[PDB]
Structures are given as C-alpha cells and as structure tokens.
Amino acid sequence: GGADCGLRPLFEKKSLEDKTERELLESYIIVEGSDAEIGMSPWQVMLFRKSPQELLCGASLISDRWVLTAAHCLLYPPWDKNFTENDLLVRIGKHSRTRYERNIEKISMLEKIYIHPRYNWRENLDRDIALMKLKKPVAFSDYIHPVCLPDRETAASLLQAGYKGRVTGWGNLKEGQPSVLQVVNLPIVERPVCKDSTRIRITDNMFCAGYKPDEGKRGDACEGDSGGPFVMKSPFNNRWYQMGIVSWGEGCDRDGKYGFYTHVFRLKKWIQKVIDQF
C-alpha cells in the first residue's frame, strides 16, 4: 500500500480533524504529551521482544510488508544489544500499551532486518535507520494504515525551523508508563541551535526538535519512544509524511536539550534501493 498513504481512515477519509492537527498547520508559515485519539496514528507500530515480553521501541508502517525504525533498536553494541528476526515481533493497530487488543491489533513476524551499512553506533548514531520485512502482508483497517515517505519537494518546504511535527509513542512519561499511546507536537529547531546544545558531533543526517527554554512549552520523546515516527501533515495534499525517526537525546525534556531525529529524506535512496532489491 502506498497510493493511499498518509490518509487516515478515521480522519482524512471522513473529513474529520484530530484535536491538535490545526497546531501543525498553523505553524507552516513521551514527556508532556497527551493521550492519542483512536486511529490518530494508524502507522504506529510497537517493536516487541518475544523472550521477556517487553516493549523495545516504536516503529512505523510504510507499506503492507515494510516497517521502518531506528537501527539502535536492533543493534547497539555498547549495551550488548544485537537482535535478530526471531527475537522480535511487531504489533500493529494498537492504542493500549499493555493490553493485548483482541480483534484490533495484528502481530507479525519478521522475515528480514536491514540496517544501514554506514550506521555509526560507535560515535553519534549517524544514519540511525533500519528496515524490517514482515513475513506476511498486513491487512489495513481503520486502525492500520501506512504513512507516506517524503519526496524532495515535500522535504524542502516542510523541514523548516519553527514548523511543527508530531511524535507518538508508549515510552516513559518522565526521564511512569502511559496506559495509551501518547502524542506531542514539537517545532523543528535551527541547526546551529541544535549543534550548540551538545558536545556530540551532529551530521546532515539528523535534525533536532523541541521547545527552547524561553518558549514556555515543553515536550520530548523518552525511553521506549525511539524508533518511532516524527510526522508532518502536508498542507498541499493533506497527507501525513514521516520526516524523521526518533533517534537520540540527552535525557528527556531537559531545558536547553533537544531530541534528535534521523533525517528520512536524506536516507531515502537507501530505503528505495533496499525495497527495490529485496
């Protein structure tokens, strides 16, 4: 699925708007978040461990058989983390964090995991991106639907300082756990400001987002949210596009710090190549 990407069965398709999307549109020229609405993020996926039944990370559905996430969720040697297809399963269509959602969610097994060959776990998580092929295609529904991948022009016009994106996840609410999927809208921050907030070498394959100390508003992703989608709604065709992947941050919601995200468009060629070959 991809011709109908970014159009939510319970919102766009019915001409209904969610509680906070206007905030995103008005800016075009999870800690401190809120409960998501049912069907608000139908591409949200839960990365899950089979052994101790645990939430590992968030992820997103980009087609009936492909899930996108952060590579650190799968491979992070400094913490002795190195998962294979058989160590995980994906849960699509969820709202409740712990509750197994009978008749609503779908569970899939992984066929193959592809980690960007130049993923830099040794230093700054440069190119923190991974693709996962589902063993069997997932059937879409009101709660399951793929998000679109950005094209050059969508990335050009939307990825600007001040423009707000949206992050969703079942991660920690503070640096305990939410009962349902949380959502927070955050503004993209100027690259210089991102660089000057950390000692870590940031690259062109990343962007940071969050409110500045003087802005009053707060919000950020936290443990459990990584691998999840940072999305924006295009004001041109009204579809939702995944601009980033929750990558890293120093703590959660700390003043003067910002969440960092993988720049999806810059790595789009690797995505296309992988899906076109495998």
Partner: peptide
C-alpha cells in the same frame, strides 16, 4: 537515550 505487558495469546 538510548532505548507490565499482558501475555500475547497463541494468535500469531
């Protein structure tokens, strides 16, 4: 950073 559950029935 860096990266309670109900058992999943044998339904996948």
């Amino acid at each position: 950073r860096x990266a309670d559950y109900e058992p999943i029935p044998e339904e996948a």
